[PDB]
Design a binder for this molecule. Structure first.
Ligand SMILES: OC[C@H]1O[C@H](O[C@@H]2[C@@H](O)[C@@H](O[C@@H]3[C@@H](O)[C@@H](O[C@@H]4[C@@H](O)[C@@H](O)O[C@H](CO)[C@H]4O)O[C@H](CO)[C@H]3O)O[C@H](CO)[C@H]2O)[C@H](O)[C@@H](O)[C@@H]1O
Lengths: 729, 303, 304
């Protein structure tokens, strides 16, 4: 190709104006095969310039000067200057050195993490460049490990500046796009490390129904298999492939009962102790792998071994899939050691994801992160977080930052996994976040005390949790459409603010704030409430424009940074003027696709929403106050329109238009009602409540209402009253 | 010592006195150069105020009106007139809110919560404006005292406070723009009426004298050492004081014992953000609560 | 030297750069032709306009093809080049390892403005004599970030006046000028007094300078150079000899507001000592806490 340049023992491939592959080969042979990370090096031709001399070469694109002075790659021989001024003297890459600016990526797991842990770098940098080293093995055409690359150094220089979305799109072109998820993955999951019977598990699923809590997924954790019943001469019961017949005397019948309730079923698999002589599948595996059964030779875990993988999928997983298991929860915690040098977690995710496609279309796994490119094997499983406010306060930042290495389907244990402390408010705040996260999977530890069942908690917490769990199912149309946009266009569901606002310093100063699809901006509360206010809070950055609370219609004039206060039952979620959000009207109704959509419209601007579905596309347009709905294919779907406060159209079939210029634009939300509510719940003196209500009612000029609250001895009460005054300005 | 002298100068009588200690002299030059110069300035101000004091004295004797009134004499139905114990009217033209608490070392400024009655008020010294009615924490360096005059206020000052003479040979008429006003200067052997009506300033006296009148309209000396009765039209003259938000902001940030990165960010953000409500929202996020209140006073005056 | 620069056309001609592709003359002090173009075609025109000497402000690492630190190449070659136009000329640059005392002056760079930074700096300065690097120039009052305190600025200037070099410098803040009249009348007058004292001391400094050059004696010595067997000479980190006639104990802690005075524990060697400014006497040998108003600095001279 003209986009390929050799010089000395190096090869440079200009993939885009902003993406250069850099290779070294001692043998003069360079690597064309795919790697664990890289699936495609076919990119459209681009323009660039070369200055080639006897001893040096310079490659010049629109955004980078790449220099190579010959010899072995060192910090002195291989380096690059970006054509940006984001920093005064951090604009140079040196081979093998770190520079400032990296916005980070993700890490394998949150196992045993109480609050923050270090993250690996991603491809995004405030200074406009990042290097992604390809240290993986080569693949065969069909995707097996083939051994060591002939490019003994193989790097990708990203020089996208602050065009983060294009960097991620081209990363997906290089490493392969995320596959489409199935719609069932986006609903509520039930999980608990608890020794249920068939009977008690079905009773709990029927209790969810009775309690008006929708579920898509039934997880069965490790007590599905033999645990205490494993003879100690075999080691532990952690690994198992044999049903506990006391708890599950007829597994296929039990899975049939979950399938009748329209649940997908996954089992915990701890693979590390392989298939030992006590297991139900051992006689078949022993025959296939020529094991010495009289010496009870174990089929040890070896995902480098083709015969072991086949016996694992066909003879261990196969019989359980035949009983009705839909997909695998790969729960690997036993290290990164293999003879090949390939991480066993990568071998599991790669081969299990491929194998899951045999029995179900667009099937998933649930497994820990296995390095760049492992987004090809959703879903991410973050693991055994400590139950704490600190863990919750880390998790929104963790989730949005992961988009910077393309790993956009993290499933966290909602409410935290293990250890830590009881606080029903922490559980409720964690579920609020979960509902506005990639995946909403309730899960917990082997404690008698850590169930995430809403009715574990008091009547107030229970009702709020049920409301949020129903909201998750209302959001499935929006989530599923965003899922198809991840798969087809390389856009993350969850974006850091700086994807949309790369030049706004405040977009880098609100770690836990994020965009959730294209219509919603989320600022989860992740700190225990101030007991004097009976409200939690978060500092929200409002970009330029008019914003509304998604739930209340409270307005906010951007651009501003403003501390916002919510009761424990309420979450800060915002939509711009012109936002259109579809909701399932019937979130409890078991049906493959919604028979009714609510179109929720935020007044004050034009807007547009495209609802992508399995077998349709539906466009909602809001232009000069006219709302139009069209679809590619006709259906019997009934549309409901909510314009600000008011239901305008109820259950209307087919394509249509309706003029909303005549209809009431304003939400009900008002300063006086909100003021009364905040004062009434506050654990402060009644004389202070009386004086604030009287003075804020009497004082007419906005600037003098603000001067009055500025005198308040309660600093946080000032900020809460200021939020109401700012919204009422 | 300096705050006490500020109060004394705006009290009925300004008598420096002390104990038998070798260490308690009230001589200004007992203190460092900054304290000394401020004390000398306030002591000279007391003599500038003698015409105003002496006129108020004759009003106490003849009309039974106190020089120093609690706020509630003028504002009996305003609850805030009973909630500012140390605030008072000083004659009929000036409202005083002495600072009587040690300065906040992070701000290098003392403070007092001032109740501003309905109307437009000016700092007597700086011309900083305040829109009543409002209760507002005000901040001053140790060398500056909160004293306020309404739009239309006329205050006579002795131009020659050091000059030994039984009655001033020269009066400065200090006029606060924005309203009509009137002041009657009662003296041992005269009465002099200053009127400010529809922008015309008139001075008349019962008895003629060789006294020379100086007129200061807001910022600017209009008339210098003019003899006799006269009128002059000030409708054409600049009403506005120099006081401005940006200069005052820079000064408060510059003296503050806070981080330079905080000074840089406040100066930059308050300069860049155009909408008053968003400038107030920016200062509301500040981790320093008292710095919020100081910045809020400047924003309120600059609204 | 990038393609927008005024000297670029000359440098491009000399180094055979591709001007239509705007090829930069990248920094390469390993390269004889680059060094010549840098001194002759980049610095040369600015020297012709009257620039006397170069402030080399290098912060971009230790990487070169040779393995020689670029800061060492700059200090070595720039110091040599500075001698062409002026006798006994200087540079101003960061420390480049043992032997780099051959290229004065030392430039310590972007200190944080704090009491902690000031409290480190006398110890830092005297200890540097132990690797022969005796001409450190610190930013007097601190460089950047940190906190405002006019007393910190005044104490820092007191130290600076009794340091190898007295260079006032500051950050890009609107709020960090070291102008004496930035501060109140008391601080301003004290800063002016100390700045005048620096010029009164130039004869003493210049004589000590010729003694560094000819006899290998540092201007600033740790106490233990003169008193190697006295344990107290190792226990007063910020105390030092300043030439052969003066012993300095800078105050580097905020004053005690109850006393309106700062303090430092001074070790007085055997002998009769006088405060340089007041004549207050002290009988050595003794360790004694001494107190000074913010306008006064502990500096001592022996009888004789
Ligand atoms: O010759 C100038 C100066 O250089 C050296 O010291 C530097 C020091 O003064 C300071 O300078 C910074 C600048 O680097 C520039 O930084 C910005 C930063 O403020 C922020 O806006 O974010 C951008 C983007 O990330 C930065 O690039 O401007 C600011 C003022 O706002 C200056 O403070 O910091 C750097 C880094 O530590 C120093 O290199 C030199 O030592 C000094 O003597 C000299 O005066």
């Amino acid at each position: 190709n003209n986009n390929i340049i050799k010089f000395d023992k190096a090869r440079f491939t200009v993939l885009t104006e902003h993406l250069i592959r850099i290779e070294y080969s001692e043998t003069g042979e360079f690597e064309e095969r795919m790697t664990q990370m890289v699936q495609n090096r076919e990119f459209s031709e681009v323009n660039f310039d070369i200055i080639e001399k006897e001893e040096t070469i310079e490659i010049i694109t629109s955004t980078v000067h790449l220099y190579y002075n010959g010899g072995e790659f060192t910090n002195a021989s291989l380096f690059a200057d970006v054509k940006f001024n984001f920093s005064v003297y951090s604009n140079r890459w040196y081979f093998g050195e770190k520079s400032d600016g990296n916005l980070k990526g993700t890490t394998r797991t949150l196992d045993m993490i109480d609050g923050e842990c270090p993250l690996e770098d991603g491809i995004m940098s405030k200074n406009g460049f990042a290097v992604l080293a390809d240290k993986g093995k080569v693949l065969t055409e069909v995707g097996d490990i083939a051994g060591n690359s002939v490019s003994t150094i193989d790097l990708y220089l990203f020089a996208y500046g602050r065009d983060y979305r294009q960097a991620l799109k081209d990363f997906y072109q290089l490493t392969g796009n995320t596959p489409k998820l199935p719609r069932f993955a986006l609903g509520n999951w039930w999980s608990r490390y608890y020794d249920y019977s068939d009977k008690s598990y079905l009773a709990l699923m029927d209790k969810f129904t009775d309690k008006k809590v929708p579920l898509s997924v039934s997880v069965i954790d490790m007590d599905w298999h033999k645990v205490s019943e494993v003879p100690s001469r075999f080691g532990s019961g952690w690994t198992g492939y044999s049903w506990n017949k006391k708890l599950f005397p007829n597994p296929e019948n039990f899975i049939d009962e979950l399938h009748q309730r329209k649940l997908k079923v996954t089992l915990n698999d701890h693979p590390a102790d392989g298939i030992r002589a006590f297991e139900d599948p051992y006689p078949q595996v022993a025959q296939t792998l020529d094991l010495n059964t009289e010496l009870e030779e174990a089929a040890k875990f070896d995902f480098d071994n083709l015969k072991f993988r086949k016996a694992y999928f066909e003879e261990v997983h196969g019989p359980l899939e035949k009983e009705g298991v839909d997909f695998w929860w790969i729960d690997w915690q036993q290290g990164a050691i293999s003879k090949s040098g390939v991480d066993p977690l990568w071998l599991l995710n790669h081969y299990q994801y491929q194998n899951a496609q045999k029995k179900h279309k667009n099937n998933i796994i649930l497994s820990r992160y296995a390095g760049p490119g492992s987004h090809r094997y959703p879903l991410g499983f973050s693991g055994a977080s400590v139950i704490s406010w600190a863990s919750l306060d880390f998790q929104p930042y963790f989730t949005s930052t992961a988009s910077n290495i393309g790993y956009t389907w993290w499933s966290h244990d909602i409410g935290g996994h293990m250890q830590g402390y009881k606080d029903a408010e922490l559980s409720l705040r964690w579920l609020q976040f979960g509902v506005f996260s990639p995946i909403n999977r309730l899960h917990s530890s082997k404690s008698e005390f850590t169930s995430k069942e809403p009715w574990h908690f008091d009547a107030v917490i229970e009702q709020s949790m049920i409301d949020f769990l129903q909201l998750r199912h209302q959001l499935i149309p929006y989530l599923y459409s965003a899922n198809l946009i991840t798969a087809s266009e390389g856009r993350a569901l969850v974006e850091p603010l700086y994807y949309e606002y790369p030049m706004e310093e405040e977009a880098y100063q609100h770690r836990n704030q994020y965009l959730f699809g294209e219509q919603l901006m989320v600022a989860p509360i992740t700190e225990k409430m101030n007991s004097l206010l009976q409200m939690g809070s978060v500092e929200v950055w409002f970009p330029e424009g008019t914003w509304y609370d998604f739930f209340s219609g409270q307005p906010y004039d951007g651009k501003v940074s403003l501390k916002v206060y919510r009761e424990i039952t309420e979450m800060p979620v915002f939509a711009k003027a012109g936002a259109i959000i579809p909701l399932d009207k019937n979130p409890l109704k078991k049906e493959e696709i919604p028979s009714e959509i609510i179109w929720k419209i935020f007044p004050g601007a034009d807007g547009e929403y495209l609802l992508l579905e399995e077998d349709n596309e539906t466009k909602a347009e809001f232009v000069n106050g006219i709302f139009t709905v069209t679809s590619k294919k006709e259906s019997s779907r009934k549309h409901t329109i909510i314009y600000g406060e008011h239901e305008i159209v109820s259950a209307k079939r087919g394509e249509f238009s309706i003029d909303l210029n005549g209809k009431e634009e304003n939400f009900d939300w008002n300063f006086s009602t909100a003021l009364f509510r905040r004062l009434d719940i506050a654990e402060i003196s009644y004389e202070q409540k009386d004086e604030i209500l009287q003075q804020l009612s009497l004082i007419e000029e906005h600037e003098k209402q603000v001067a009055f609250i500025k005198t308040n001895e309660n600093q946080e009460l000032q900020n809460s009253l200021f939020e109401l005054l700012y919204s009422g300005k």
